[PDB]
Amino acid sequence: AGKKVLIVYAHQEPKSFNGSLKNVAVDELSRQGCTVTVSDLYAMNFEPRATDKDITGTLSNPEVFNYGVETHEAYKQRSLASDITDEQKKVREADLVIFQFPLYWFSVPAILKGWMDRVLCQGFAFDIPGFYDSGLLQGKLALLSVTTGGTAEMYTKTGVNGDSRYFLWPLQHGTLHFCGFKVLAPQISFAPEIASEEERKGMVAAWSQRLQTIWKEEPIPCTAHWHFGQ
Amino acid sequence: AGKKVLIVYAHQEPKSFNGSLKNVAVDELSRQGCTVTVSDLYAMNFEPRATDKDITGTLSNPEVFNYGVETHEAYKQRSLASDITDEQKKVREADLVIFQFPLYWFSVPAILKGWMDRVLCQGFAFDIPGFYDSGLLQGKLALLSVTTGGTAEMYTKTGVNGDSRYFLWPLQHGTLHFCGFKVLAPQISFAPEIASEEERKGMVAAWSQRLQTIWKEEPIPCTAHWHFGQ
Numbered sequence: 277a278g279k280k281v282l283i284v285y286a287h288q289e290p291k292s293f294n295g296s297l298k299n300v301a302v303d304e305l306s307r308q309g310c311t312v313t314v315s316d317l318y319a320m321n322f323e324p325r326a327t328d329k330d331i332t333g334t335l336s337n338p339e340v341f342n343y344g345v346e347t348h349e350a351y352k353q354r355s356l357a358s359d360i361t362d363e364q365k366k367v368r369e370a371d372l373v374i375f376q377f378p379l380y381w382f383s384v385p386a387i388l389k390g391w392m393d394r395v396l397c398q399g400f401a402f403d404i405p406g407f408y409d410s411g412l413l414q415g416k417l418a419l420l421s422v423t424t425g426g427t428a429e430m431y432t433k434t435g436v437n438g439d440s441r442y443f444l445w446p447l448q449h450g451t452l453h454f455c456g457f458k459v460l461a462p463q464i465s466f467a468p469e470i471a472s473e474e475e476r477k478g479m480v481a482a483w484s485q486r487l488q489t490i491w492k493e494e495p496i497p498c499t500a501h502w503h504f505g506q
Numbered sequence: 507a508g509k510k511v512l513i514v515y516a517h518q519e520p521k522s523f524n525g526s527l528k529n530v531a532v533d534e535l536s537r538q539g540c541t542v543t544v545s546d547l548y549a550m551n552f553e554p555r556a557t558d559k560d561i562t563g564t565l566s567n568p569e570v571f572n573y574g575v576e577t578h579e580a581y582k583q584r585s586l587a588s589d590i591t592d593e594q595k596k597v598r599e600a601d602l603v604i605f606q607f608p609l610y611w612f613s614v615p616a617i618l619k620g621w622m623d624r625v626l627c628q629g630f631a632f633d634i635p636g637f638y639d640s641g642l643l644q645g646k647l648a649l650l651s652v653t654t655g656g657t658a659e660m661y662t663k664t665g666v667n668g669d670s671r672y673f674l675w676p677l678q679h680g681t682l683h684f685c686g687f688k689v690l691a692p693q694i695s696f697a698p699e700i701a702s703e704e705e706r707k708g709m710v711a712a713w714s715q716r717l718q719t720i721w722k723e724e725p726i727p728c729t730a731h732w733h734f735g736q
């Protein structure tokens with residue numbers, strides 16, 4: 277049958293390299309017949325802050341507010357904020373979640389960090405216990421499509437940045453695997469600003485071409501060994 | 507002399523375990539005679555999103571928005587938003603920057619990620635050249651004071667989360683070292699919600715006591731080996 281894809285997109289500028297990577301993914305996945313949804317976080321003015329406004333109603337323990345405890349309960353009570361609830365429906369129904377973003381400080385831009393913090397709540401994405409291979413989003417795939425300022429060479433073990441896989445750990449393992457996702461190999465488009473027009477068009481085409489057979493891919497083993505070696 | 511400290515604090519609840527760690531830091535560093543400032547990001551409703559509103563000057567290219575370029579240029583003309591500008595003054599003058607936060611998704615809460623993204627702009631925190639040991643915040647000390655849900659056992663090589671050092675890499679190396687900070691050993695207070703009240707009190711006391719002698723500690727070698735090696 278057909279597949280559902282959610283692209284969580286975090287760039288301010290539609291004409292950016294990120295925007296182009298997002299658009300070619302929509303084009304290609306749409307052409308295949310997939311159901312495609314894009315959460316364009318900056319266009320949505322998506323709220324990144326984890327606050328008590330994320331629960332509508334009386335808190336369990338208002339005297340000492342604990343975001344995790346209160347959102348866990350709100351999830352069960354169906355009292356989370358609308359924005360969170362709407363994202364959760366998209367994730368729940370998705371077969372594949374693609375994150376499209378520029379690397380900010382070896383991680384996701386804060387608006388996307390806020391999506392992770394607020395949407396992937398206890399009771400929805402994981403339980404304690406009920407994580408990693410017992411996470412609640414088991415059966416789903418995730419894929420990081422990241423662009424960098426630094427070159428591939430800088431992101432090697434002997435480059436000033438260390439290997440690119442090193443910075444993936446909190447995202448792939450600590451977040452996605454934790455919630456039970458299987459993780460498809462990352463798409464890292466290095467240093468588009470430095471690249472020539474030809475190399476840039478090539479990186480966009482490579483992503484589109486990869487997407488043609490994305491459903492045939494197997495996920496990585498999201499292990500310490502995969503990320504760090506030895 | 508040389509004992510200005512900025513605490514960048516990211517917890518919603520003054521009565522929280524994080525709040526207590528922040529407060530004992532203020533108490534002890536104030537007692538020493540340090541100059542102490544706290545940026546209480548949630549109380550400030552701090553903006554986490556990197557947007558064009560961060561520039562108060564005329565955009566150089568309003569047709570195609572490039573956050574990096576526009577903020578770099580605006581920094582040099584004192585044309586960044588006042589919230590950023592005010593944080594930059596605090597960092598510029600600080601001799602030590604402590605980050606106090608609960609671990610969210612193997613990283614900082616989004617509101618604190620947004621402080622990093624928006625405050626540490628090119629021209630202020632780094633330049634090219636002017637990064638890693640040559641970063642523009644060279645000579646300053648930084649320290650991560652992190653609290654977790656996961657237990658100490660979980661954050662070992664034999665545990666499900668891997669060594670805690672693994673998740674520090676984007677923060678300590680990719681952010682702090684990149685901007686020229688020397689990085690003091692992290693303070694990780696594991697699993698306060700699982701600890702008894704007395705055990706929590708012990709963790710708070712340990713931090714207060716560590717701070718008595720913080721100014722003469724040796725920084726870590728902020729290398730891949732420290733983070734991922736034996």
Ligand SMILES: Cc1cc2nc3c(=O)[nH]c(=O)nc-3n(C[C@H](O)[C@H](O)[C@H](O)COP(=O)(O)OP(=O)(O)OC[C@H]3O[C@@H](n4cnc5c(N)ncnc54)[C@H](O)[C@@H]3O)c2cc1C
Nearest residue numbers: 292293294296378379380381382423424425426468469476
């Ligand atoms: C706050 C912050 C923190 C950062 N931290 C890091 C970090 O830790 N590590 C790191 O490596 N980098 C870092 N960077 C840099 C950042 O990752 C890059 O600037 C970003 O990845 C560039 O992607 P972009 O989409 O903005 O590029 P763009 O500047 O939009 O793209 C580059 C060029 O590609 C062109 N283009 C767009 N579409 C196409 C197309 N279809 N075909 C051909 N050309 C096209 C554009 O017009 C442009 O000329 C940071 C940046 C910021 C702002």
Ligand SMILES: Cc1cc2nc3c(=O)[nH]c(=O)nc-3n(C[C@H](O)[C@H](O)[C@H](O)COP(=O)(O)OP(=O)(O)OC[C@H]3O[C@@H](n4cnc5c(N)ncnc54)[C@H](O)[C@@H]3O)c2cc1C
Nearest residue numbers: 344522523524526608609610611612653654655656706707
């Ligand atoms: C969105 C999200 C993502 C998360 N991701 C992760 C993750 O990736 N990895 C991970 O390990 N954890 C994760 N967690 C868990 C999170 O790190 C913990 O919930 C957090 O660190 C707990 O710290 P706290 O200050 O909020 O605790 P609190 O709940 O505030 O503290 C516990 C108790 O300490 C009491 N207390 C306060 N002061 C004192 C004192 N002086 N002496 C004794 N007791 C005191 C409080 O009253 C409270 O009852 C995540 C949580 C959320 C919400």
Ligand SMILES: CCN(CC)CCC[C@@H](C)Nc1ccnc2cc(Cl)ccc12
Nearest residue numbers: 424425426427430437469574578628634
């Ligand atoms: C000389 C090149 N300059 C000067 C303006 C163009 C700006 C390019 C910017 C986006 N590159 C970067 C911006 C911010 N952080 C980074 C971190 C790493 Cl590791 C590598 C490159 C980065």
Ligand SMILES: CCN(CC)CCC[C@@H](C)Nc1ccnc2cc(Cl)ccc12
Nearest residue numbers: 344345404454654655656657667699700
């Ligand atoms: C009131 C219910 N209490 C039990 C004490 C829940 C406390 C458990 C919470 C903090 N644990 C966690 C919450 C959220 N994420 C996590 C990620 C990892 Cl890796 C490990 C533990 C996590």
Ligand SMILES: [Zn+2]
Nearest residue numbers: 449453498499
């Ligand atoms: Zn994993």
Ligand SMILES: [Zn+2]
Nearest residue numbers: 679683728729
């Ligand atoms: Zn380092």
